[PDB]
Amino acid sequence: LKEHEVTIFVRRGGPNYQEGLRVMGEVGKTTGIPIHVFGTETHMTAIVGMALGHRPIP
Amino acid sequence: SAKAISEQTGKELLYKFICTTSAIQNRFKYARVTPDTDWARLLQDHPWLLSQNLVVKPDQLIKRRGKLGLVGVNLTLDGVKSWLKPRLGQEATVGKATGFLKNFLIEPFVPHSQAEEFYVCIYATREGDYVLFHHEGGVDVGDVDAKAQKLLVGVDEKLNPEDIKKHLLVHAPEDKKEILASFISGLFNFYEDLYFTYLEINPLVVTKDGVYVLDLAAKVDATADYICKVKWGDIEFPPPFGREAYPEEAYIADLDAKSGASLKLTLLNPKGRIWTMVAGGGASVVYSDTICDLGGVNELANYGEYSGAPSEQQTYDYAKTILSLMTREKHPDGKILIIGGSIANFTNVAATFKGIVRAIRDYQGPLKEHEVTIFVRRGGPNYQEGLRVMGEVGKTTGIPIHVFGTETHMTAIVGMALGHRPIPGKSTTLFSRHTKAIVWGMQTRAVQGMLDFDYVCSRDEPSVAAMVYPFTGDHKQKFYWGHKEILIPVFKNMADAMRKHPEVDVLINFASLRSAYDSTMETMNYAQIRTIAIIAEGIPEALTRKLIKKADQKGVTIIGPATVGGIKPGCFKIGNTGGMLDNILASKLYRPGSVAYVSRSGGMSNELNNIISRTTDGVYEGVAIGGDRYPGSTFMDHVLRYQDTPGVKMIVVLGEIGGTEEYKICRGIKEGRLTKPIVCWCIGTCATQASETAVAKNQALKEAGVFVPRSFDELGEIIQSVYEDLVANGVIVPAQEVPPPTVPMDYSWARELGLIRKPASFMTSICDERGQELIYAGMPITEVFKEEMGIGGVLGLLWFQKRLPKYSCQFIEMCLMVTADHGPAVSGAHNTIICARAGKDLVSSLTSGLLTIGDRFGGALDAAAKMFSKAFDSGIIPMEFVNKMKKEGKLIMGIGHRVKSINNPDMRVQILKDYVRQHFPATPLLDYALEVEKITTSKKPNLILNVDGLIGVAFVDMLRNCGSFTREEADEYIDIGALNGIFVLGRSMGFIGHYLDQKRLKQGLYRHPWDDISYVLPEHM
Amino acid sequence: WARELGLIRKPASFMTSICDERGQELIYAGMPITEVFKEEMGIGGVLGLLWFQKRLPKYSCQFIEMCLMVTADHGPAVSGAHNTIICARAGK
């Protein structure tokens, strides 16, 4: 997948949504396949709005 | 200890224990004169004074006599006396120091014209051993370090006199070598096994008759006093001489001598306008640096610290003296009081600021009445509350206190109140996120800190592989891996523990100086130990010479003594540096950093955690090299470790005063070793030689392009500029902040302040055991025995949890008394006697007998209650109830006796029956059962109500016919089986009576003979 | 819920060096129950695992099962079996 040039966009909510953000934030840090983590402060389908480059990524 | 030495007592050891072939003469010969004695007392304890000549010196560390005439040279006794009246105790100046002349070491000048001594002596550092030989004496050599015969005695080699004759003594007279040299060999013994710092005998010369010695100057090492009560002995120490000390300095020095606490307040000029009363090292020095290099040679008032936790009254006393520096006195421009640090130690600041709260709260007359001003700071966890309480009555009697956090640098308040700004196979991965370590010692708070450092850095495995001892058991200790409970082993023997654990490479050493050698050298000849983090401070320098020669042989990379850690964050931490997790997670140390340091002190290791982590991206190493001078793993051995590593990028370094050492770094700097960004700073000028003062060797760091800043001020500013310049070309990429997860607090502590939730089991509406008395159903034991309820009352309180009235308790007592033993043929008492007779114990015998109370034996109590209850509530006439029980089989339970029938009543049925006829109101069920009895005794004579029938019907009568029970409470106690319990608690008395009887009659085992069994086995299966 | 996400703490009693019930299999001393039946240790094997927490050899488990086969009933006259027949005869 490092041969295949991937980018992960994640948007999430639920029970332990914040520490779910924590734990998958540190694993997206530990192996370096890039994960864009997003919580509930964004719109739900905004991350495919910025995944196709139609709006910026904070 | 041993330190400055008193030369009466040092020469006691030397002159009492000297051993050589050609004689040390002039032994036991030393003396001391004051005007507080005569010549006579020192003349009589040292009588040889009437034999040889005399030289006299002030033993207040005063130099250069011979040309000044403070020796009375060739002068007689009364000449010396009428010399003592205008010189023993008058003023003189040498160098630049004047003073009184009171303690005169009056010493054997051996009767000599200037041919009869010979020059030696020897000084030490931390590397190898420097002996100085000289032909040219006199205290006027000046540069004695440039012309002398120097010789290094190397690592681990002993003197041969043939070595001395071959290449050190080219320049010596020979007719006295056959005496002196053997003499001289013994005198060398005064050095290396004595661990000196500096030792000199100067001017000294050879003749025919003797060998001679004159003038001692000595600086001596300590902590093996307990080893040397056999060889040093009961030896005494002087303090240094100065002006007459204002009493707080001597109170503090002898207070260091008294307790285990170290309290510190030492004056430097009494009429300052900047007082420093600090607790901590780094802020004290740098604030007094911006003082004492900007003109605090003339005014600067003091310096101090305090540690070691003195008790209630002792810190109350020290506390009221420190209601003696800002409440009294004056400087017309305004005075400062400097209390520094960086977020506060492990004191709850209720503790050391119980020191400083009770140091304030009291005396406002005698510290300031004449204008001083406070600022305050400290370093570790738990700060805010003690800052407050010093605020509390320091405020409501009116004294202004400015409390702080750490938004400032170490230099601010000396920056403000001069009118000056406003007032507010050897491994190279030493530490990593997979490094596996050993803790020597019980450090469970900081074991939790270090396993916390393994968990909160998002790492995989804990830091402690074993506790590696001689003196306990083998077990495992419960600690926390995050939230899981894990078990980490504590060991008896160290060969056992190294035998048990080969996963093992780095040891944190809480061994004492008694067992640094046996335990820690035993550890150091187990090859498992790669970096030895020695929390013992001062394995002595020949023992640690065996260690450092073994760190070049065995090669182990020692980051040793007095370390508050060797902390690579994200990766590893040794003990208790930094603070709480406030300082680890607030400085983003769970994903890796990039910037290393080497420092000297620990009180600024708090603020250099604060700085190096909060102005740069974090700590990547901290190396406290030791407070001495040849580092065992140095600056450079870790610069080697990081310059070749592709992840890490830049480094910080610290220094101290006097001598040529940061010149070795300019052997690194001038020759071009370091290309990474480096940041350095030097501690403690206070000159009130030249070279590792901050100016001269920050110069001798500064020049060839390996970076040092000016001061500690702009170290935040120049680290900020260097960091933004090194981000500016795109080699450092800053990480984005992730929330951290810790110690999870406790179930007990989060419930103590009430924060989690938990459902409880075991509902128990009975017998509150806790509180100021044992509480029964609702009633105290004093109210139990004071209202005078017997055991019937407490059966009501235990079984039904209601205060039954005074007739019902007595009825229950009577039922328990007639449900006592009914003889030993019956089956439960039979098993009791079989088990008692097998000699088991009381409780197993009784309980095996009570485990037969069922339905066929002893279950007539509940059955003869439920049957009559089901007949009386579904009411039929007993003349048809007895026929209804006739129509179904199933004989009426509780009716029938083998013997005692009628006109012969059962006479315990009668005792209970005439109890219920008398003391028992409202009794319909007994009237029903007695009419059943009147019907049944016409059938047969025997056919009477049993006591097992009568207690059943009378107890249901008690329950559902007195008060306190509804009919869903009374019938629920019958449906549950509370009538079994009466028979059981009754018959337990008779069972234990049978047990005690079968033990007391001392019968052996019962066997049940074979003519009572009649085996009926099948034919052949 | 707080321990499902892990933030509070609790020290545990009942130290039980035996028989992990939780997880995908009934683990005995150190061995899964399918490994109990595939290695074919009998009740001597599980007495080794339960009582001593040690895998006893194939002559030892056979001796332990023979041993439990001889320490069975020794007739109804003796003291404990007598108390059993009394308590059973009261129909408990």
Ligand SMILES: CC(C)(COP(=O)(O)OP(=O)(O)OC[C@H]1O[C@@H](n2cnc3c(N)ncnc32)[C@H](O)[C@@H]1OP(=O)(O)O)[C@@H](O)C(=O)NCCC(=O)NCCS
């Ligand atoms: C043989 C004899 C004893 C009968 O035995 P028995 O009376 O049935 O034994 P019991 O006393 O236990 O039983 C009689 C009643 O008591 C009842 N009963 C017995 N135990 C009971 C119990 N725990 N609970 C309630 N009822 C019980 C029975 O249900 C029975 O009822 P029933 O007779 O109305 O049907 C009687 O016939 C007799 O006395 N014979 C000698 C006299 C003689 O034969 N003379 C000839 C010439 S002199």
